[PDB]
A paper describes a structure:
In this study, we have determined the atomic structure of, and identified the chemical compositions and interactions within, a native RibD-enolase protein complex from Francisella novicida. RibD is a key enzyme in this pathway, responsible for two sequential reactions: the deamination of 2,5-diamino-6-ribosyl-amino-4(3H) pyrimidinedione 5′-phosphate and the subsequent reduction of 5-amino-6-ribosylamino-2,4(1H,3H)-pyrimidinedione 5′-phosphate. Enolase catalyzes the conversion of 2-phospho-d-glycerate to phosphoenolpyruvate (PEP) in glycolysis and the reverse reaction in gluconeogenesis.
Approximately 5% of the particles from the 2D classification, which displayed C2 symmetry distinct from the dominant population (the overexpressed target protein—T6SS effector), were selected and refined, yielding a 3.05 Å cryoEM map. The RibD dimer adopts a roof-like conformation, sheltering, and interacting with the enolase dimer to form a closed ring, with overall dimensions of 105 Å × 110 Å × 50 Å. The deaminase domain of RibD interacts with enolase, forming a key interface within the complex. The N-terminus of RibD helix α1 inserts into a hydrophobic groove on enolase, primarily formed by residues F350, A354, M136, M353, T384, and C363. RibD residues M1, N3, I4, Y7, and Y8 establish extensive hydrophobic contacts, while electrostatic interactions between RibD (R18, E42) and enolase (D87, R89) further stabilize the complex. The RibD homodimer is stabilized by its reductase domains, where two swapped β-sheets form the primary interaction interface. In this study, we show that the Francisella enolase dimer exhibits an extensive interaction interface, burying a solvent-inaccessible surface area of ∼ 3,200 Å2. Thus, despite the physical association between RibD and enolase, enzymatic assays indicated that their catalytic activities are independent of each other.
Residue numbers in the entry:
A (entry chain C), B (entry chain A): 2 to 429
C (entry chain B), D (entry chain D): 1 to 350
Write the structure that this text describes.
Amino acid sequence: SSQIKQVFARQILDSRGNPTVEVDVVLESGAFGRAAVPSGASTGIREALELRDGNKALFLGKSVYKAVENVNTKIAQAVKGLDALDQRLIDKTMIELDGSENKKNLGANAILGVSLATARAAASHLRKPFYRYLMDVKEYLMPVPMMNVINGGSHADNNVDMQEFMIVPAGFDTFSEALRCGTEVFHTLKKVLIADGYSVAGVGDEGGYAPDLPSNEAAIEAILKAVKEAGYEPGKHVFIALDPASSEFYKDGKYELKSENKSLTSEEMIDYYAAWVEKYPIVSIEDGLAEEDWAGWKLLTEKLGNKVQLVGDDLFVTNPSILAKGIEKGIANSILIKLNQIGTLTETFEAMAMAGQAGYTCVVSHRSGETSDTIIADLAVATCSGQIKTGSLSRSDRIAKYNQLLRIEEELGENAIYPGIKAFVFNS
Amino acid sequence: SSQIKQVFARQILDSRGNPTVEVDVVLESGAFGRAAVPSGASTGIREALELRDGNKALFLGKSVYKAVENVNTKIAQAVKGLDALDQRLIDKTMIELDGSENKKNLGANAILGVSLATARAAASHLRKPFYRYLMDVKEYLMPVPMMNVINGGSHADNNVDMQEFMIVPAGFDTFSEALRCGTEVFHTLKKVLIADGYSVAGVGDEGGYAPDLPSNEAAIEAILKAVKEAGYEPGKHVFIALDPASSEFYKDGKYELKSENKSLTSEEMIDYYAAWVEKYPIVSIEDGLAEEDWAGWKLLTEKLGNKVQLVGDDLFVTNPSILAKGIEKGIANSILIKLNQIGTLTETFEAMAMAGQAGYTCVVSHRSGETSDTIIADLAVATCSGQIKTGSLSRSDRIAKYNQLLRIEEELGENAIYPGIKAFVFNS
Amino acid sequence: MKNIDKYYMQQALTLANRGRLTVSPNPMVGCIIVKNGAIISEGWHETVGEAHAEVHALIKVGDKAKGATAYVTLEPCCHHGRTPPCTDTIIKAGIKKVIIATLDPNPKVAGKGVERLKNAGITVEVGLLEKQAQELNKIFFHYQTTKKPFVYAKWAMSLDGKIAVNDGDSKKISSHQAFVNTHELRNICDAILIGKQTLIDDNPSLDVRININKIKHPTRFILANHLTTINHNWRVLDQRHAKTIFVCSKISAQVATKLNQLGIEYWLLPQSQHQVCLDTLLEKMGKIGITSLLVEGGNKTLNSFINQKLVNEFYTYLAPVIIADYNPKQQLSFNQISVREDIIINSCFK
Amino acid sequence: MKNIDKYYMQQALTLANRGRLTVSPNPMVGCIIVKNGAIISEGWHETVGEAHAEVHALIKVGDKAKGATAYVTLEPCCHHGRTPPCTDTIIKAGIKKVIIATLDPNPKVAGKGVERLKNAGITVEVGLLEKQAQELNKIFFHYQTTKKPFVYAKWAMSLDGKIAVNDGDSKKISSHQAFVNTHELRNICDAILIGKQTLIDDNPSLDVRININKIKHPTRFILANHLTTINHNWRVLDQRHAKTIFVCSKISAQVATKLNQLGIEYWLLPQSQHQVCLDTLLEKMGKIGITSLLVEGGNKTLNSFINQKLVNEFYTYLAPVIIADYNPKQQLSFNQISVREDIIINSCFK
């Protein structure tokens, strides 16, 4: 039998030394599933909210005892006895039990942990790999990774207005050569940043360096010379991916580029982005404009939608309603998918199916407070949308995903293919 | 049947972006075990040897294709058909097959991976936890964690001549309160280092901060200030552990403290350590003297052996012969245990059994390049060693061990004992 | 995502499987209506006589399905005049595209709904996840293609191969999970069949005694080669919950008159291979309305059904019990069960 | 590390288990010698008549064992004729402390090696990991405490509970893993027992036909209530590999003369419960030298042994076949096996 027998939760620590909820689900046949919830935002009006105690005598205020107790009483007596192979049933049961649109009463972490643990238990019951449980097809696409090499203004004191710079090794026939290229370029970038007399000692939350660069041009040129110093040609083997997250330096309708001491409007901001577009092998602009400036987003999709890929993270917050509004208004041509932002697996599948039928490309993403669970690699392989954003090559919470991808690539030897440059559907 | 059916190897990446060997072992009954080898030293004179390709066209020069091929041909055709429940037979089979004292012909990583994977497969075959498979007793002792908070000489350029400063939360009745104390003190230490105008940009390999402190006294005072500001009393709740590793600044028989610009002999060096011993709540001195200066080690054990715990890492390199020589000469007070420094599980057990019968305390240790495997937590619980050295609270390869310890202490709820201050057997 | 249609069809089959225990003799049908990339409808056939999956899916959405897409695991029924056809509801709703997993198993009905939909210009695709949707409906597909019931054989045995126990024993060779599985198979099946010897020995009632939302007691069949004795204390003579039918080849006049007075219907069939004609009995049950049949207990009945190759699936309840000349059976305890090509079992107790 | 003695005793038990197949009728004994916290000696008992575990451990370390500690699974022999006394070797080698898991199972010998060791001032501790060391040596402990053989019951049966196939089939209801397990049990056991009917029907040779280090053919016992017919083509009459003993209650004069000419030894025992006296047979087996007994095949023999409570452990080989009224077996295929209190099996290939 595949009915749920036991649901248990406990308070563990994530990759940043912060409490988080970890859930175990045991079925009647003995199948066991385990799921940890990466940390997300505990306040807002758009995303699903995360419940925390707010006790100063506890960890800082971040104890998650209320979420664990809510699981162990309410969700355990609600979802006990349901068939674990019907994900819609458990998901809608938790949604109806909670009774709020933003999951305030029970918290999104509890619900997401229960759903992921149930999915893993069901996959173990059928004796299947998790990506084959999610989607059972013959031919699979291996994701193209974006590797966060340089961190910027929000993550460090750099005098850099940009947030993240990434390398995309898209000129290879297999995932193994792409991973080798990423590793070699990371090491050569460390050596190059050392040679130019920069502070390199240390590492960020996502494994990327945060040197005190003078400008964004210097960062891009350093990345390009690290690419060409490691034996690979820029523009043919390694491309550049951007992440401004321009909500930080937007005030009163003006984009404030503090690194160059400029105040730009929208159309000239797109002009700057285009100058970069035919200046460098840059094909990605994630959150290149604010989430409140939709007119500029429409302009950007009009005049740059056929030259690069425009990604929206704060714009769509993994929400089917906002994504549908963006589709009917014709804004952007990609979406960044985060599991924690919506709270259930079925709504994530609905959002990515909407993006797939709209013609967009999906990018499975990670969070800052990551755990040892490697579910996003299986998620990216299963849905055959080959692009992933799972950090750089510098720490185990970012290396476990690439190790899982290597195991998948070797266990699907004939039936796994790597779409190197064809994975960027922005031209023709 | 528990006979070995299949042995397979892979080149995966560790927490530092360097290749390492992973081994999967499958028995005839279907039991599956998987083991990853943390990176060790690839050259030396008194340690087990690690084999690397030495090819510049590959990753940098460090790829493990030779070790993987050696596994897949030689070790796979050697250990196939042997009983997985006889660890000694398999280990001595690999030792005899390799035929060298430092495991030069096959590499220590291959042999250690095969042995650990075989142990995990045997434990899974019996349907037992790994710590309960290693030692099946009723009462278990939870390890006292030593948590790295400051990194110095080799880990950073911050003119601190001592390597590591660590906090020991030994004033609590359970492991959960100790972990909460470590978390709160870590966060308050970050806040204190920020408030004093010190750059805390980034995190180290072992999860600890590397600020530009002026002296070691400043480091210890900052740690004590963080303990006081986090709500706990120094000397009753939190003690301090040291790691000088004086092999770095020992030349021509002189201990050169570059931070204070001093040259000291051995006797004044132990005098300085004693001044620190009744200056601060410091109970540990790991590698407090050089590994070639055995006379100073004997004098240090003579006149500081009953006041603190003396730990030897480069002195004994997890070697039964050198440890036996140190016991017969009466040197040091404890030993730091690393798995890959000897290459097999049975030799590790022999070393710890000798240390236990000699009256020493054992501390299970981690390494710089770590994987997602959590062998050392189960190892520390199984052998009832009351100490562990598994890093700080900042990374998943350092947090997975603490999560495993939390799961163990709730699984053994009645039969788990936390020896807070009694775990330091140095007085009476 | 690149396999969106497969995803929606898999969700449709999950919705269809939601009605596992209560739909016979009607099949398992799920339905999903998708418009603008968002699923706004859900439907599944849950009880016999109620609304079909398409109607249950399209009534709740009103008329917001204009221009949507339908994922339906079975061909919509058109010839069935008992209710307004689902094709009519689909056409009035305004669905542009209909994707069907399998055609209707009946050859005379197969293709009629597809053509009727394609007259109105609707786009019809048939063949997505066809094998899974045919395996989900194995009972209905077998009954429609063959016009004979689906047969389940289920019995319990000890470790040495004995089904029945000695006289005076507790007569329990099964645990609670076997009880639950047995009553679930009783709820699913449309009939229950035993032998005369089992009736005179155990005196069983073939109802359902666990918790199901809709309790569906199967029709009772009592197989007897010769009918001479009728007992008043038999529990199967109570017609309050279900119906009891006596299958026979030679019946006495007194027995026939007693059954006519009691209201029990008897079936007279020829004799073949030391039994009644089982093929004729299967044909008659198929004609009268039973879709699936369950055979429980009796070495004679089980052996007769096995020898004619009429069984489609098996169930065995093996307990750690030794059955011998002992008046009470001696319990055991399993130590190693290694499941492979052939089960290898080790027992330590006793 | 805190439980070092338990660790060393566990290693000694592993070395003892290293000699599982080729030690009967001798017991399974391991040995560790530890000096200065380092294990410098290892020993286990393998083969009958070779060096004892203590002698094997202490012959490599001629003089480095002075003042060491011995972890020995079983109490060392004092006056037994298996080997020169290991207590003498321990005393001469200079062992300071001896730790013993269990005492010797024989009451006439238990507690004398301990006294001999304690006469010389050696420290003796008895009782560390005693239960595991008694479970490891279950066969020898049972034989020494009871003076009756340890007995295994092993048979293969189909899904419907039939042991013997119909006349004409391949007579195979077992796989290769069952073959390996059967021959390993044959190598372990000191005897093999079948019935007269099984030998008539199958004509089996009860040797060992697998690739292992040392072949130990079991002693053959043929049980026959009445002996009247002797066949020249029997495979058990060949005495080149093992020995054959006929057990009977009534034997013809011609049969007795033929057996005397052939060199076959017959045992005459009284009749009890439609069989020969099995208790007297077990007593004679214990007296003559057999330690382990293996009973394979034959419904009569198995039923006779089972209902009289002789059997100590069981082994069942269940295959997915149906054996009922057909010359060829109807091969099945399992779909899912749920192992719990009672095994629940599902299969459909028929």
